[PDB]
Amino acid sequence: MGKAEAINEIQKAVASNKVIVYSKTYCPYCVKAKNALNQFIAGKYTVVELENRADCDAMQDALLDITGGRSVPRVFINGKFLGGGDDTAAAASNGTLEKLLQEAGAL
């Protein structure tokens, strides 16, 4: 369950989920992204929590190679990386998050 497997697992889940957020339970910025998505698609998207994953370091290492950063949250829509918690809440406030969800078929 090294880093190569982590990159493969994340890429497959990002491509097969309209909306997916890699997160941790105790994470105020993850809550920021979750609350932004809950404004439009509450209870209709995947959250992968990492704090109890034995390969959590490799998963965040994989998130670094895929997105440029390794911190949670990491929000993907329609196979495309959106950003973190601030990026997601900013998209919710300016109207683009709603449109990105509509174009992804999730809304």
Q: How far is CA 67 from CA 1, 9, 38, 70, in A?
A: 20, 14, 23, 8
Single-letter amino acid, residue 46: T
DSSP-derived 3-state class of residue 74: strand
Close Cβ partners of 9 (under 8 Å, ≥ 6 residues apart):
59, 62
State the DSSP code for 68.
S
Determine the Cα–Cα distance for residues 43 and 103; give it in Å rounded to an integer: 19
In this structure, what are the phi and psi dihedrals at residue 75, rounded to the nearest 5 degrees? -110, 125
| CB 67 within 8 Å of CB 74 | yes
Determine the Cα–Cα distance for residues 37 and 79; give it in Å rounded to an integer: 16
Q: How far is CA 64 from CA 12, 17, 29, 101, 104, in A?
A: 16, 19, 17, 24, 24
In angstroms, what is the resolution? 2.4
Q: Please, what are the domains in the chain?
A: 3-96 (3.40.30.10)
